Amino acid sequence: AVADVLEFGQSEGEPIGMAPEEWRAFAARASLHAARAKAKELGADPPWDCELAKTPE
Amino acid sequence: EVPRKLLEEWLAMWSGHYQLKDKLRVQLRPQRAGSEVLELGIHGESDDKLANVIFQPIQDRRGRTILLVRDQNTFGALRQKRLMTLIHLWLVHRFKAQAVHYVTPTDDNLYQTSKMKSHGIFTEVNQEVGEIIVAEVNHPRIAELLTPDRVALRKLITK
Amino acid sequence: ANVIFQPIQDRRGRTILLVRDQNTFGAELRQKRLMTLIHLWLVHRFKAQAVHYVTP
């Protein structure tokens, strides 16, 4: 979700806070808390909700 | 999923209709370094600023997005051709705005908001306490204009 | 005295008070920091980061 926002910023010619590959490397080893905090620093705060997608159980 | 290029495409339709050759480019950046106030600029091939909107997107208590407009101008004597309406259509779509507030009730702002009401961008326009113009977005009309077939939009651009 | 204002949030989630109007109506009450006390309370009440005045 954050990658999509960063790619859009790049396509729009806005200045890169971090490269796509750099974000992916960070996200891969980040808690949700840490990923959200970092995204917020980069001005990327996409709507994302894992609660909505939970099964009936 | 609302790129600057979308407004550039609309302005190409516009330039085409009015037989103006100058390729109009769209710029959206902080009005100055590190600011939450933004400037939408329309630039020609010479990079001259032909129109602008200076504004800050904010949220009210109910979480509704409002664009606080500090200033808007059609600089190039481009006037009387609905350019500012196109810019507002794009801004309202880009920021999913519920309303636009104008900080100073200048003659131009009253004129422009009245014009955009007639184009259907706004349902209501009212000067409120503090002498600010509050313009409520006509969501059905915005949706109509953004239809991919561009029929309603072309009609707006070409009169 | 009065303050007419709307509390709003910027992109960063910071609270700003948008002040449309402020007045110290009573002449006896002026030059005594009344409006300062009101603003102290408003800033505390709404946990404001900034105050914007619409008309200079």
From Swiss-Prot, chain B:
Effects seen without this gene: Deletion of icl2 has a little effect on replication in media containing glycerol, glucose, short-chain fatty acids or long-chain fatty acids. Cells lacking icl2 have no discernible impact on the kinetics of M.tuberculosis growth and persistence. However deletion of both icl1 and icl2 eliminates growth on fatty acids but has little effect on use of carbohydrates. Cells lacking both genes are incapable of growth in mice and are rapidly eliminated from the lungs and spleen.
Induction: Induced by palmitate, acetate and glucose. Repressed by succinate.
Domain of life, source organism: Bacteria
UniProt family annotation: Belongs to the isocitrate lyase/PEP mutase superfamily. Isocitrate lyase family.
Protein's job: Involved in the persistence and virulence of M.tuberculosis. Catalyzes the reversible formation of succinate and glyoxylate from isocitrate, a key step of the glyoxylate cycle, which operates as an anaplerotic route for replenishing the tricarboxylic acid cycle during growth on fatty acid substrates.
Name assigned to this protein: Isocitrate lyase 2
Organism name: Mycobacterium tuberculosis (strain CDC 1551 / Oshkosh)
Designated gene of the protein: icl2
